[PDB]
Design a binder for this molecule. Structure first.
Ligand SMILES: Nc1ncnc2c1ncn2[C@@H]1O[C@H](CSCC[C@H](N)C(=O)O)[C@@H](O)[C@H]1O
Length: 279
């Protein structure tokens, strides 16, 4: 694929194979202490940084280091979900889901839109809104697992969350592909000359498929963690953001394609419950 896409793929799969071997080694030799493992991974994480910043300039490196980082989170998440106590095993899969999302997000953009593929398509979360909401679900899981370890041992539930996450993902990406270059991480106010309307595939089902996938995936994140507090909070925060965004995004869509979209509004719902769009 595009150049900025091959860098991420090699950095992601590469970092995921380095620390996978590391995690394999630490298992077959009974290396079980938490501070020792943290120090080994830290050791080799340092290694990957300078091997990458040596082989890459500022652009390709800020791309590579993020790719490999997610790879790290990936391997470490599965590692925790396999060898951590059953009080914690849930948080491992959660980590893995998160890493995959943030990576498959960039890779999707690099494919369908190699032109504008940056570190924001890697989309490390530095958006003051999400960061607070993300870390806040962690502090609830560990406080509820410390005081209520049993709550985090119901593995059929957390697997249900995994399910809704994988689905929301497939819909998300399958929508980013279906839309092609028309897709955009940001809402557009001016019309491109190659921007046409999409109504087939997943868009035949929803006016905002990706928003649907991202919506249920986000809810599934807290269904995995079995956080009784973050599940409702995430559902509401996600809902309102997609209400405003879907609203304005549809208004611009109305001045974009006029009646085609007014007909598309009469023919397909937004995809999220209780969001009408721009009527
Ligand atoms: N139905 C549609 N067909 C083609 N382009 C669309 C579209 N809806 C929004 N867009 C454009 O793509 C950008 C948002 S991408 C939004 C995708 C959609 N919410 C989903 O979940 O699948 C907006 O700037 C808009 O200009």
């Amino acid at each position: 694929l595009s150049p900025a896409g091959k860098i991420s793929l090699q950095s992601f799969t590469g970092s995921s194979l380095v620390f996978f071997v590391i995690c394999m080694f630490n298992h077959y030799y009974g290396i079980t202490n938490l501070v020792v493992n943290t120090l080994i991974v830290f050791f080799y994480a340092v290694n990957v940084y300078f091997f990458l910043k040596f082989f890459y300039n500022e652009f390709a490196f800020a791309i590579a280091i993020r790719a490999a980082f997610l790879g790290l989170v990936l391997v470490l998440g599965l590692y925790i979900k396999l060898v951590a106590p059953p009080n914690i095993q849930i948080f491992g899969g959660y980590m893995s889901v998160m890493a995959l999302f943030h990576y498959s997000e960039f890779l999707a953009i690099a494919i369908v839109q190699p032109k504008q593929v940056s570190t924001d398509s890697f989309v490390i979360n530095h958006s003051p809104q999400y960061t607070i909401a993300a870390v806040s679900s962690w502090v609830e899981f560990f406080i509820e697992t410390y005081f209520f370890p049993a709550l985090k041992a119901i593995h059929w539930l957390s697997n249900i969350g995994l399910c809704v996450c994988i689905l929301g993902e497939v819909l998300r990406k399958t929508a980013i592909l279906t839309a092609g270059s028309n897709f955009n991480h940001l809402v557009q106010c001016e019309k491109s000359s190659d921007h046409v309307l999409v109504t087939h595939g997943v868009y035949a089902w929803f006016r905002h498929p990706s928003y649907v996938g991202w919506f249920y995936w986000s809810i599934g994140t807290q269904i995995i963690l079995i956080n009784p507090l973050c599940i409702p909070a995430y559902t509401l925060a996600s809902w309102m953001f997609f209400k405003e965004r879907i609203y304005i995004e549809e208004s611009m869509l109305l001045s974009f394609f006029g009646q085609q979209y007014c007909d598309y509004q009469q023919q397909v719902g937004t995809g999220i419950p209780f969001i009408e769009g721009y009527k």
